[PDB]
Amino acid sequence: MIEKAPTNVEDRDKAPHLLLLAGIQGDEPGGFNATNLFLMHYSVLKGLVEVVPVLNKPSMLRNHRGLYGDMNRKFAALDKNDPEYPTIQEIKSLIAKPSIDAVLHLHDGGGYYRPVYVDAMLNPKRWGNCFIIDQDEVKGAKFPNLLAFANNTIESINAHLLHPIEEYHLKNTRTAQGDTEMQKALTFYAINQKKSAFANEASKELPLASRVFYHLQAIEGLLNQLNIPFKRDFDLNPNSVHALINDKNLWAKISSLPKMPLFNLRPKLNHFPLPHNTKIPQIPIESNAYIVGLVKNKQEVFLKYGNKLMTRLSPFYIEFDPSLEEVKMQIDNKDQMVKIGSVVEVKESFYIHAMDNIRANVIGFSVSNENKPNEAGYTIKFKDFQKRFSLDKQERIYRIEFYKNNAFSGMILVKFV
Ligand SMILES: C[C@H](N)C(=O)N[C@H](CCC(=O)N[C@@H](CCC[C@@H](N)C(=O)O)C(=O)O)C(=O)O
Ligand SMILES: [Ca+2]
Ligand SMILES: [Ca+2]
Ligand SMILES: [Ca+2]
Numbered sequence: 001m002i003e004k005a006p007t008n009v010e011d012r013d014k015a016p017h018l019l020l021l022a023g024i025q026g027d028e029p030g031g032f033n034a035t036n037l038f039l040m041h042y043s044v045l046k047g048l049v050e051v052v053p054v055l056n057k058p059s060m061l062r063n064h065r066g067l068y069g070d071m072n073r074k075f076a077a078l079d080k081n082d083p084e085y086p087t088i089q090e091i092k093s094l095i096a097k098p099s100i101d102a103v104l105h106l107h108d109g110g111g112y113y114r115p116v117y118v119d120a121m122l123n124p125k126r127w128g129n130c131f132i133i134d135q136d137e138v139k140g141a142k143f144p145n146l147l148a149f150a151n152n153t154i155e156s157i158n159a160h161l162l163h164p165i166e167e168y169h170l171k172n173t174r175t176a177q178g179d180t181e182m183q184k185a186l187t188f189y190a191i192n193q194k195k196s197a198f199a200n201e202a203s204k205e206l207p208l209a210s211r212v213f214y215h216l217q218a219i220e221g222l223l224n225q226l227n228i229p230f231k232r233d234f235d236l237n238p239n240s241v242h243a244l245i246n247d248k249n250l251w252a253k254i255s256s257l258p259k260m261p262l263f264n265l266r267p268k269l270n271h272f273p274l275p276h277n278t279k280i281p282q283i284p285i286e287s288n289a290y291i292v293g294l295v296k297n298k299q300e301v302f303l304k305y306g307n308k309l310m311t312r313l314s315p316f317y318i319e320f321d322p323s324l325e326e327v328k329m330q331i332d333n334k335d336q337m338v339k340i341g342s343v344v345e346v347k348e349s350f351y352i353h354a355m356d357n358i359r360a361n362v363i364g365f366s367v368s369n370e371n372k373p374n375e376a377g378y379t380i381k382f383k384d385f386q387k388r389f390s391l392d393k394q395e396r397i398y399r400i401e402f403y404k405n406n407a408f409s410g411m412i413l414v415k416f417v
Pocket of ligand 2: 041
């Protein structure tokens with residue numbers, strides 16, 4: 001859970017609290033890209049929005065609806081030995097917190113829901129582009145009138161339709177009256193804790209940016225109904241959404257390695273250092289996004305951003321010796337200390353000063369066929385690189401790797417600008 005909170009802690013209790021959740025199915029990227037963009041680009045000014053951006057991360061990482069079965073059928077009877085049992089308790093505990101008032105659960109769904117059969121794509125069996133309640137009223141909730149809240153949220157979404165076919169409709173599953181499937185799902189659990197609970201569906205027929213657009217419309221519609229004041233730092237249209245999903249400023253930091261751009265990496269990165277004796281899911285990974293991770297696939301390690309494959313790492317596993325903190329380098333004739341794990345911009349040249357006990361391999365530069373070379377003490381320019389060794393498709397970013405005996409002492413990236 002990630003908090004989107006006012007800067008003044010005192011403002012937390014001055015408006016309602018919403019719990020915003022997506023990615024209970026790992027192949028529904030509208031939902032988890034929307035929670036991602038919300039965390040990255042919105043501000044909550046009073047009250048609080050608690051976000052679990054992706055409920056089923058292992059499944060997201062494999063582009064899979066649910067590796068351990070349908071997580072959204074696990075909110076009623078559940079075997080204590082179910083692999084998702086701990087996850088389910090975390091979620092139910094967030095839902096049932098006295099400080100939470102409302103719950104919004106995002107999904108992507110096939111076709112377009114219509115309450116009357118129109119055709120195979122538009123009918124009551126379909127799920128796309130609807131706003132869903134389990135029943136019209138939840139007595140004892142802070143906001144008991146789910147129906148009114150839903151109708152007003154649908155109004156807000158329908159003020160912004162990209163095409164008429166995308167019109168939102170109310171879907172009331174009347175769950176307690178015999179819907180045994182929905183009785184096992186998240187929002188029904190929430191209403192049983194006297195929370196006002198809603199699900200939004202964006203149609204799988206839509207491109208990702210349009211799915212995310214509609215989820216964000218639903219989030220804003222509901223925040224307005226709750227009177228949780230918010231801002232965002234962008235204009236809400238599909239182009240703007242696309243730009244932010246595919247943002248060149250997105251990065252990932254694996255272990256103590258430098259920040260790497262998410263987009264426009266080469267599809268495969270060879271001889272990539274990873275800490276030994278460390279299970280893949282336990283390798284630290286930081287990002288300015290909230291849906292990034294690593295997953296093992298055969299012998300490779302995939303860098304994932306939602307369902308997008310950003311690169312395939314071909315690792316070599318090695319001790320990460322943390323002793324080397326900085327390296328003396330010259331950049332465009334300007335001498336300076338460079339922290340291990342830095343990215344440095346270069347216009348013309350660089351040079352690494354020799355070090356006792358430390359060997360430098362500039363990846364893409366060579367002066368011999370030594371398999372374990374020392375390339376400190378060379379003045380290096382762009383023309384000196386074999387461009388295929390670049391980290392990026394643009395052939396501008398190069399790895400410098402440092403070794404102390406048989407241990408890995410760190411990496412610095414140079415970016416030619
Ligand atoms: C074809 C394949 N079985 C498939 O992906 N079906 C989906 C089925 C649609 C689907 O999952 N809705 C959700 C609705 C849940 C709403 C609400 N109670 C909640 O807890 O948020 C579900 O039932 O968990 C499709 O048609 O979009
Ligand atoms: Ca932003
Ligand atoms: Ca779903
Ligand atoms: Ca080299």
